[model samples]
Target chain A: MDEILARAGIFQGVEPSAIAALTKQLQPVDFPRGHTVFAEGEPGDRLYIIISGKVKIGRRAPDGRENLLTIMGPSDMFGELSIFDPGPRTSSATTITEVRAVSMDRDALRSWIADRPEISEQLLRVLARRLRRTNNNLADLIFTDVPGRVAKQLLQLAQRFGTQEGGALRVTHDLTQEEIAQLVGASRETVNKALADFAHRGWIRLEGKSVLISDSERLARRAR
Target chain B: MDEILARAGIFQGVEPSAIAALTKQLQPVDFPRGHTVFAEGEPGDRLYIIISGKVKIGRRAPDGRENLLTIMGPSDMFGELSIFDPGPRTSSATTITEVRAVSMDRDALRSWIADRPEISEQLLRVLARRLRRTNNNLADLIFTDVPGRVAKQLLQLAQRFGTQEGGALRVTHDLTQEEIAQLVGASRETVNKALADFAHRGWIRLEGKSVLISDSERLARRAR
Candidate 1:
């Protein structure tokens, strides 16, 4: 629970007693791979904190193409933004693998925050940070090229989830090339070409689904 | 105050008493034409409710080009989105003409909503609508041409601000050709040519510091 709070980016500086008060209201749930956790236009009643496995959040385009918007791994949070109003989900969340998650109902969370002003402040800070990140995404989409975007996304993944080994960062997440393409808003063909180019340049090594960054600084420079 | 709430889409179903409570916290202020109410990177401590005249929200690029993001008129709300987290301003808000508005501080507004759950619900609805609008803008940017985008923006303005005499929608706001170019991501020459073409087709009538959409339906059709 402490690990979850730390990764959620909210609940920073919150006491264990306060978190325990909040966690008592949460329900633990599991879903098999390929299951839809929530769909677009469905009422958002609960927020989910991933404990294990992965979840993909995406929108279905008019032509039936799925645009992968974002992904969540263990200890990361989802649905915090939607709890304030309990509106219909903006995007669908689907399990990429068998998943374990803790869920908190909107009403219960609201009640908990109502009594804990400090927790509410922490939540607001989280929202503000998320808003800034979203705005940065908007700017990147407007100005950056597809290859540059993919490079930046990979750099972000390494920063958030990589483990360092001999000056290199290895990302343990089992991500498919198609999934990377979807997240970066590029064609699979384009992503394949870019990845191949990066491999040729010795920036990354692909071992099955695991990716190892050879040089973080070079990757960052290339991305920028 | 009741009339203002009635005109605002977010306040459609809000109780008069609740709105009255919210309005009592507002501090009214006036600005002369061409004056900036808030500059980019300034603290977003307050939200503005426009009472009269027009206000333009824009961001200046590194090259000193100002992109006209959106324009606000009477009863239309601006800057409400920032109140949730209250970060530095992303865009500058400046008066196109002499303007009157009511500003509410973020902390005061949050405290008021902390006591009144209904207001939070209303605000969430507003944010949800804004999110959807942002998605639409993304789609437009990806697929639409410069002329089409300009046409769509004008039609949207008409829908929100109402049509004037002679079936023209009046925009009594100041905007430069270069600012429109930045908004549409085109060269100023291109924006000028498109506007000239629209005028030639009798689709719009451009007067000093104002635009009249002479044929809104026809203009909207151009966005197809």
Candidate 2:
């Protein structure tokens, strides 16, 4: 777990003692597959770091659609915003598979960052990077096309949850068409149509449970 | 200036001594109406707190349209993200009126936050609140209609820059139709159509400089 903590981009370059201080606070918990680690509208209390498995961070749209925002895996942090703000969870975190995770109470998370200025610096950069992602999502929703958005969604999922297999990127997650619709802010039918278009173009191939991108650069250019 | 800092939501309840320390770092500046304080995509270096006047935070679209996202007034803070993130400005800030402001250098802001744990807590809440706002903006763009979104925009603006006058909520900031279009993610013609519709319905009135909401509740309900 200390090794995992060290590998996290935000924890990089910290002294072993500081890293030990951080690891000491991590309390382990196991969540079964499909367990909701937290839900939207609940007061956020702890910040979680994944030791194994996957968690998806998203929200429910007003239209009753699942808005799949982003997915997280090992070393990825969720609910850190709650450590600072202590408000209702802005998004839900759900375990996609049986998960090994650790959570630090809000006070611990806050004081630790305060005492370790380096951690605070990295935390800020992590937040900035997330903010950048949200800004891009907002821009795409306003200006991009459904196919373009769908392409972007595929690329995003693949980038986060993909693995190299046969020289193509295989998105490890089994994202349903409905989920894709939510990510692109479109209907399931629209998402299916877009994916069909991509498949027909040989840009992506839909396997049993994952999407394989043949030419990521070509597919990305089409997202515009 | 110290008084204003204390009143700011970001610094509420911070001790006088901390507030004085904060104010000492605040270097004053002024901007004429319609002046761009900072443009989107420019690297962010400082965080500004408004002492007087108003600032509009927005961005430009690829179609050469404007996107008006938020308004900040006295006691409000802009570019708070810079204190930790130190990244490009996500939105442009322009003076909506003659503006008196003070800014703290990024490092100064960061170290001050580190020195004062309470400030870090407040900063977290600030970021969490902004993230919530952006989340809502994305949701509205995906789920709501033009007039609904337009009405929502008005409600937001009025909430941030309004005062009760003659029994109506008069949005103190002057919002141009183009800015409205940008906020609603619609065309100017579409926004004008929506505003005209609202006026005809007796829900709101467009005065010379500001908008007066006759029925904010009714107007907000229309957003759904």
Candidate 3:
């Protein structure tokens, strides 16, 4: 637990010994696959840190479509905004797979930061980075075509979950075609068409849930 | 200048007197209406604070469509993310009206925050709020129809620039039909259709660039 907290990117600038003390305040929680940790608009009280497994942070539209805002893995933290803003959750958190996690309530995390102002700055940097990424997503949604968006999505997924496979990048995640479409903010039919077009162009090879990026340069060009 | 800095929402929680000295580092500047203050992808070395007039922080799509991410007026700040993250401008800034603004270079602002760590917390809060708002915008774009989006956009604009006149909220901004469509992330024809519907339904009355929101309850319901 101490190791996980210390290694978490959110605690990078703080002393590891300081985080060692933080682990005691965190309560271990286990969640099964497809379980929602929290829902959007619910009162947000606890910030969760993933110990293992995948968690997707998403928002649902009134029409029943859900957009995947982001995905988190081990050593990543979600729901930290509730600690500072003290409001309902902005998005929902659901386990992509069976998960082991730890959570700290708002008061504990707030007081922890009060002791070390640097942690506040760390959180600030994280939020700043998120703002940049989200802005980029906004730009892509506006400027890029559906194929470009799909390529960009695959590139991002590759960066996080891909591994080298014979000189190509192989990305494997738990998201279905519907979820992938949601992440791209496009209809499933459109996203699927984009994916098939990419495959036909020899930019990527789709193998069920895994995508092998054989021509990332071509994919990058389309993404631009 | 001191008063502007003190009242600026970004500088909230910092001592007003402390800002008096910091004003020396700020360079006051003016731009005519329709001027580009900064373009997206340009190096970001300074942050701007608005003393008066309007600045729209926007991004353009590859096909020549533009989206207004947000706008700022008196006592508001823009280009702040560059100060902490030290990257290219995430979006372009252009003057909607003749803009009177002050800018502080990154190094100067960094040193000022180093002296008062509380300012960092304040900035963090501001960024957190923006992230939440941006996330909400993303959801709205995905889930809400064109009319609902137009209603929400009007409510937001009214909150920032509206005035009460004869029991109605009157929102007046310098955005044209095209720009208003950009703000709503929709085509001009569609946004115009939505506006005409609103006007026809007696929920709002449009006069040139001003929109008088008469049935805010209906607008707010649609916004949700």
Candidate 4:
């Protein structure tokens, strides 16, 4: 549980005593690759804190195509909306690899937050940051084109996981071209073409499921 | 101040004593129409509770066009994000009319919430609902077309402020066609055409600055 707390980005800098109080209320869970953790329209009861591996968050469009909204890695949180409203889930989450997580039911979370003032403050901060990120994504999608969006996304990923060695980003998650297309709301063919162009321009290197950002500054400038 | 608290949707069901305590720290201010109340990239210090008139939340593009992201009415709360990090404002808020609001600094809000546990819970619930609304808007904008988006927006406006007389909405705000176009992310020409079509279909009546939703259900179904 302490390891899980350490892995959860939102809990960083939280007091150990507060972590202990929260950990007492959390239940650990594991899911294999390709398993659905939750589906759209299911009653949302618990929020999840991912400790390891990756998960894909997406929704099925009316045309039967999957719109990949986000791909989250270890330390990324999900299902936080369930803590306040007991409504049906808006999106489906699927494990892309063996996942380790700690699940806290809404009742338990409410009780824990009530007892720990610091934890409540931290949670609000986390929610506020999420709101800003979501709003940024919305604005980008509306105002930016495929190449610009892809460039921005790459720069964001590089900043989060880039290494100086060969100036590449060591992205451990499995990402398909189709998934990238869905994330940017573009066709798969368009994504493929954009990636090819990026690679030719020496801005990024795609090796299987991993992407190496060779020239992050160029990518960043292209996004604008 | 107590009267203002009584009208606040987020503070409903709160005790008068608690409301009195909360409003004691409020600072009132006035903003004229077409004036920017807050702008992106500026420090966020206070949360605003609208007392009268309307405010539009938006961002400006590099092309110098303002995108109307959301329109908040009286009793609606804003600036929750500032309460957390006190970072730069994410979106700019502009007064649509002579705006009167009660402002609460982050310190005051924290103290008030700490004093009244019930108020904290209510605040959390309101923030959660807002998060959901933003998520829903993002999904719809990504999946739906211009006409569908316009229809849905009209239906929502009707539901929030419509009257039964002649099945009209009776929008009180003096919103220009340009503002409506920005709100729905459509061109002025496109919005004018859509409004004309709705009028022809007997779904709405436009008189100068006011609009009446004559057939909200029909508008919603048309959106679908």
Candidate 5:
């Protein structure tokens, strides 16, 4: 447990003994597949660190359209903004698969910071990475056209979830066309057309709930 | 200097004596209007805390098109990603007006965190705020239509740069139509049409380099 806690991004430089102490205080939790771990606008009380499985962080519009902000895997942390800002959760966290996690409430985390302040620095680094990523997303929205955006997002998904087999990167991302559109900030029809174009051009092969990238170089060029 | 440093977002809750000591070590710098404080892809080295005037944080595409990410004013900080994640800058910072700021290099900031670790927590809060903002921007791109985006961006600019006179709010945002379009992630022609539509409806009056929002509630409705 201490090793797991130490491996978390927010504990990279923290002392092993302190991590062991923290692990005892943290509450282990579990959720079934497709469970909503938390919802947008709910009062935030705790931060969760993923031990296993996938979680989708998303937000919904007033008309009930959902946008997937990110996917979190093992060693990734969510609900972190709660520890710092102590406000409503900005987005929803939903499990994509059966999940195991540990959570620490806001008060416990704050008190812990008093003793192990190095944790705060680690949190700073984590937040910086997040800010940098979000900024890139924003920049991509402004700079890249729709097909290019789709290509870039596909490359990112491939990097995160794909496994290389016979020179082809296969990604079994359990997301629908609408969700992919939302990820790239485009219309579903537009993203679908882009995907079809990529497949027709032999850059990728679309399979059941997965994508096989046959020509990543071409996709990378489009992404640029 | 101590009072100014204490009021910075990253210095909140820090001891005044500590702030006084840090302020002595911080380098005060000045820049004329239109100066590039730092450029994208430059090596990250220092963080700057704004004391007065405005700075535009922006990114440019390969085609030479520019996108204005955000504007920072007094008490706001930029170049902060350097201290936490040492690498190339993700965006560029340029002076929008004659500016005054104090800067601390990465080494100085890391060493300061050793004694005043609370400063790291304060930075966490600051980064959390930024992440929340950038996420909202990304969400807005996904959910809000272009006109709605323009309305929302206008409201934000009004809040940051507007001054109330009688029943109307006047905003001299020091931006061109192209720049405003960049902020809303739309083309200049599209944003101009939206502004014209709003003006025709008597919601706003466009003047030389300024806008008079006579009906903020109406704009707010559109923004929603």
Candidate 6:
């Protein structure tokens, strides 16, 4: 448990003893697939460090609009915002797959960081990278056209969840055009139009609802 | 110089003597209105604290799509991301009006924060809040419709910058439809239509270019 804790990006420069102490106090928890872990605007004090399976960080607004913000894999530390701000959770967390994790309260995380000041440096560095990466991704998403965003999303989806097919990148998941629209933060009409455009351009082969990147070089060029 | 340094959000709770140390190192600079302070993808080492005038933070896409990301007012710190990440500037910063500010290199700011450990904690809370706030804001914008976006933008603009007139909220800026489009990350035509719709519903008054809120109550409702 200590070894797992120490390997977290947040604990890079932290002392081994600090990790051991934190691990001793961490409460082990599990959630079935599709369980909502915590929610936006709720008072949240705990940070969940994933040990296995996948989780998604998203927001479901009161107006019933939902946007998936990020996907988290094993060893990713979440709810760090709760630790610093001590406010309500900014976004909701949900288990995409059955998740096993150890959770710690804000006080415990703060105590460990404050006790080991050097760890804050590590924490700052990690957060800085995260902020920069997100800023970059969002910049493109907001600034780029729908077609470019669709291409970019296809490549990203392929990287995360696609399989190789000859010279093409074949998407593994059976996703509808509407689902693709939701993932890329576009309208269904927009995604459908983009899909047709990509197919017409011979950049991607539309196999039922799934996409196969036929000409990635040209599609990626258009993505920028 | 000392007063401005104290007012900067980045230096909140930092010791007065430490500010004095920082002031000695920061070289004062000035730029006329519309001057480009730095371009996106340029290598940046210094961070500027806005002592006077307004500035814009934005991303310029290569495909000719330009989106205004944020408007920073006096005392807000810009470019701190470069200090930790030490990478190319992610966005462009420009003087919205005539500006005067003091700038510090990455090393100076990092050393000061490291030396003043409490300051690191303050910085963490600040950056954490900023990251989460941006995330939350983007999620809503991505998920909501164009009309909802316009309404939300108007409400936010009022909160950040608005005065009163005849029991109505009067926007302070002489913002054109193009500028409004830039702020909301939409095209001029879209913003114009949204504005017309809002005016038709008696939620806001379209007095030429700048807007007057006739019924902020309803506008706020749709903003959600």
Candidate 1 lDDT, tens digit per residue, B50-129? 87878887766555655566677877777764676666887788887898887777787778666665455555555545
Put the candidates in lDDT order, highest first. Answer: 5, 3, 2, 6, 4, 1
Q: What is the lDDT of every predicted structure here? A: 0.70, 0.78, 0.82, 0.74, 0.83, 0.75
Q: Look at candidate 1 and give me any clashing residue pairs.
A: none
Maximum-TM-score candidate? 4
Chain A of model 6 scored by TM-score: 0.74
Instruction: Estimate the TM-score for candidate 4.
Output: 0.93
Chain A TM-scores of all predicted models: 0.91, 0.91, 0.94, 0.91, 0.91, 0.74
Residue pair clashes in candidate 5: none
Comparing 5 and 6 by lDDT, which wins? 5
lDDT of 4 by residue, B40-116 (tens): 76887888888888888887877677777778877878877766655788888888889899888877777766766
Candidate 6 positional error at A222, Å: 4.8
Off by over 4 Å in 2: A8-14, B80-83
**Which of the numbered candidates is closest to the native, going by highest lDDT?**
5
lDDT per residue (tens digit) for residues B80-154 in model 2? 664456667887889988999988777776567656656655655666677778888888887888888888888
Q: List the residue pairs that clash in candidate 4.
A: B169-B213
lDDT, candidate 5, B1-224, per-residue tens:
45655788768867866666657757899999999999998887888998888888888899899988888887888998866776678899999788999998877877777877777777788888788878888888777888898898889889878999989999887777887888888788999999999999999999976899999999999997
* Candidate 3 local lDDT, B77-104, one digit each (tens): 8987765676788889999999889888
Best-fitting candidate, measured by DockQ? Answer: 5
lDDT tens digits by residue: candidate 6, A1-224: 56656778777776677666656657989999888999878888888888877777777766676766666766778888877756888888888778889888877776776777777766776677778766656766667778888888788767766778888888743455655676677788988899898899888888874678888898888788
- How far residue B106's Cα lies from its native spot in candidate 1, in Å, is 5.3
CAPRI classification of candidate 6: medium
DockQ of model 1, rounded to 2 decimals: 0.27
Q: What stretches of model 4 exceed 4 Å from their correct place? A: A7-14, B7-10, B166-168
Model 6 agreement with the true structure over B63-85: per-residue lDDT tens digits: 67677767776677888777666
Second chain TM-score per prediction?
0.87, 0.91, 0.94, 0.91, 0.89, 0.85
Give the TM-scores of the predictions, in the order they appear: 0.77, 0.91, 0.92, 0.93, 0.92, 0.82
